[PDB]
Design a protein around this ligand. Sequence first.
Ligand code: BLG
Ligand code: CA
Length: 314
Amino acid sequence: MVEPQHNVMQMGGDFANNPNAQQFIDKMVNKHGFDRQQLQEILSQAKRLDSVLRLMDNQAPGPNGAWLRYRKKFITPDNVQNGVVFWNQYEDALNRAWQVYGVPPEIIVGIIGVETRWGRVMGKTRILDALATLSFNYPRRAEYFSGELETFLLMARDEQDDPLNLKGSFAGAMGYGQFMPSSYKQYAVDFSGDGHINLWDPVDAIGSVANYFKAHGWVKGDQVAVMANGQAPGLPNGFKTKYSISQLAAAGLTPQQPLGNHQQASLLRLDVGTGYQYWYGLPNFYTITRYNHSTHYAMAVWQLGQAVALARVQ
Ligand SMILES: CC(=O)N[C@H]1[C@H](O[C@H]2C[C@@H](C(=O)NCCS(=O)(=O)O)[NH2+][C@@H]2CO)O[C@H](CO)[C@@H](OS(=O)(=O)O)[C@@H]1O
Ligand SMILES: [Ca+2]
């Protein structure tokens, strides 16, 4: 009947003699009451993906058209049309997310579009393999990923999922919005109302993205970014920069749209080939970068969402 297998203390597989894997198992047992043997069975099947390690290293911390190349990966007729279809298909959920969280449909549609092309590209890497690899064979971010692995196993246990069946990105991101396990834990919501938080359910994903945004400071109705007239070659740029509107004016910039009561902004500079395009980055732009720490990412999400919004009016 019951086979405890207390004597089976050594697991096989790529992480068999990994001290970090063994310590992690001990933690899961002590802290969460996991069965050591069940965990060894799971991790014995986990694969150490060298490709995941190489990519994490490649991503480790002009004008030549850099922004245009990034932009055209997302803003194309095919993509905008698929975005329109997604918006119309889930218009009610999007409007409800707007009412509940104050995050507009274009932002949610843009996020899900850039992340997975609205569910078409969810990822093919087993979350367990990615997280085990990064937790046990990647010292630089081992603590961060171990926390993600811990949360993932707890998630799988709770929602009764086979931890080995779930797939996603090389970093362990999941579903329509590519939520990391910790983001699922802190921000995912059962927006569909069936009692279960499913990152692969478009309705849940819509509400989850909205809640993530509100939690990270999204200001309802506030502008995201305003293009500037003029150039500011001397000034350092990027989503982390901060200048008063007065300083930017002194640098030779003027906003193309009224900035309201905003007194500061980040200076964003996009490489459009023929030169540079300067923008006043407002708080909501920064909020987008909280989802994925990149200026290009945030600008593509916002512009894709706007492109889809306009394409719907037609
Ligand atoms: C919604 C979400 O989960 N966003 C998280 C984001 O996910 C990113 C991870 C990325 C990813 O999977 N990258 C792997 C490489 S590739 O580009 O997919 O090929 N995609 C996800 C959504 O944009 O990663 C960063 C940094 O880890 C997290 O910030 S942190 O908490 O301060 O660490 C952030 O919370
Ligand atoms: Ca649900």
